[PDB]
Amino acid sequence: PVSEKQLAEVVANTITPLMKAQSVPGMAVAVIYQGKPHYYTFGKADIAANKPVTPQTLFELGSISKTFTGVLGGDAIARGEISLDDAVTRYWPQLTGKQWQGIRMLDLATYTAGGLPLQVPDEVTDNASLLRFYQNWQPQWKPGTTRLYANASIGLFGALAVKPSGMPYEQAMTTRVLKPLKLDHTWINVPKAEEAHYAWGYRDGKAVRVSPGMLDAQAYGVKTNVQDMANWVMANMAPENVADASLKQGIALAQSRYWRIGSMYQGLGWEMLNWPVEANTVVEGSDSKVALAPLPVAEVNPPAPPVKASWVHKTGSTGGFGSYVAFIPEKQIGIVMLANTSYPNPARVEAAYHILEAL
Numbered sequence: 178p179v180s181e182k183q184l185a186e187v188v189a190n191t192i193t194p195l196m197k198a199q200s201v202p203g204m205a206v207a208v209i210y211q212g213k214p215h216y217y218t219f220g221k222a223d224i225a226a227n228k229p230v231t232p233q234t235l236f237e238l239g240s241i242s243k244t245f246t247g248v249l250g251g252d253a254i255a256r257g258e259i260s261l262d263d264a265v266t267r268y269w270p271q272l273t274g275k276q277w278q279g280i281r282m283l284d285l286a287t288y289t290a291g292g293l294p295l296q297v298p299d300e301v302t303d304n305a306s307l308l309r310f311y312q313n314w315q316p317q318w319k320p321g322t323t324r325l326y327a328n329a330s331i332g333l334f335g336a337l338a339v340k341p342s343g344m345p346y347e348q349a350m351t352t353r354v355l356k357p358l359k360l361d362h363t364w365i366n367v368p369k370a371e372e373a374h375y376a377w378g379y380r381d382g383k384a385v386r387v388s389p390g391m392l393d394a395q396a397y398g399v400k401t402n403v404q405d406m407a408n409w410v411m412a413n414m415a416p417e418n419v420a421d422a423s424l425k426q427g428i429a430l431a432q433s434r435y436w437r438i439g440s441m442y443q444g445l446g447w448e449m450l451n452w453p454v455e456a457n458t459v460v461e462g463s464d465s466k467v468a469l470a471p472l473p474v475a476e477v478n479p480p481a482p483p484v485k486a487s488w489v490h491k492t493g494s495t496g497g498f499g500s501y502v503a504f505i506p507e508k509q510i511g512i513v514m515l516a517n518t519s520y521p522n523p524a525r526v527e528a529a530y531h532i533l534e535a536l
């Protein structure tokens with residue numbers, strides 16, 4: 178058993194060098210090991226005001242928000258309000274274009290709909306334009322044949338996953354996910370009384386923050402501190418300890434394997450690789466050329482339930498932040514790395530892989 182001291186050094190001697198080389202002003206880390214999380218804070222949350230990163234510091238999660246969208250979706254499935262097999266059209270009858278027919282809620286949740294673009298275009302400001310956008314979309318591939326990572330796919334899935342509930346996305350997430358897990362410092366919209374905890378992002382010397390856009394709460398809009406995030410990782414890492422029954426199942430469903438893409442497996446928001454896995458295959462699958470490419474898929478039908486020996490992770494960014502989380506259920510270890518600079522993902526996973534490998 179690694180002492181608290183050794184682990185502190187291990188995190189120290191990995192993150193500082195990582196912050197120097199990538200000139201990251203601030204980052205907070207945890208470190209889930211032996212039932213408890215362990216926090217480490219470095220640098221600044223705001224250079225201009227010289228406020229150091231604290232365990233209360235709020236960070237933009239970026240694409241890591243998709244993991245919440247994934248679990249919230251699984252929760253609706255657990256309650257029976259929705260089914261992955263249903264036609265997307267079943268929750269958006271207005272979507273009449275014949276090209277949507279054999280497309281499922283599953284395809285949306287897993288970027289397998291046939292080439293939905295990485296982003297929902299900027300001309301899309303309201304409901305009428307969201308409709309027109311999707312209504313005009315012409316698929317490059319048949320459903321369930323190609324994985325093309327997109328915010329416009331999963332963004333839609335989350336907004337449609339909550340319709341039967343009659344609850345707006347923000348309200349459904351706080352009620353069914355955030356509140357039952359005691360994540361009271363995680364928000365889709367930071368309340369005025371917490372702005373003070375809100376860190377500033379840092380693009381090339383410039384202080385920045387995410388902007389509002391359609392289907393954002395679902396794909397890249399969530400903010401939290403390292404404590405809430407560590408508990409969000411503890412819940413996803415050990416759902417047995419989750420009392421709420423539907424939420425317990427929603428978590429398992431998000432970690433379930435729906436498609437094999439080379440060495441990777443696609444869940445609801447989460448992505449997985451069998452453990453043991455070498456750092457080289459996780460670091461290289463992390464490169465833009467791989468992560469943005471539309472790759473041929475292999476259906477895991479029926480969906481494989483959570484496999485403990487999995488390296489389960491998710492990377493996320495906004496203009497000014499960079500975050501990464503990874504956990505191995507079989508070994509009850511996990512890591513949260515929140516930084517206020519969007520550095521390269523391959524650099525995030527190597528550092529994460531390095532500290533976990535020590536545990």
Ligand SMILES: *C(=O)[C@H](CC)[C@H]1NC(C(=O)O)=C2[C@H]1CCC[C@H]2OCCCC
Binds near residue numbers: 240241295396397493
């Ligand atoms: C998840 O981290 C996102 C989703 C919004 C990643 N996808 C893209 C994109 O669709 O362009 C990103 C990237 C994170 C960084 C933000 C965004 O890049 C746009 C450029 C503005 C920084």
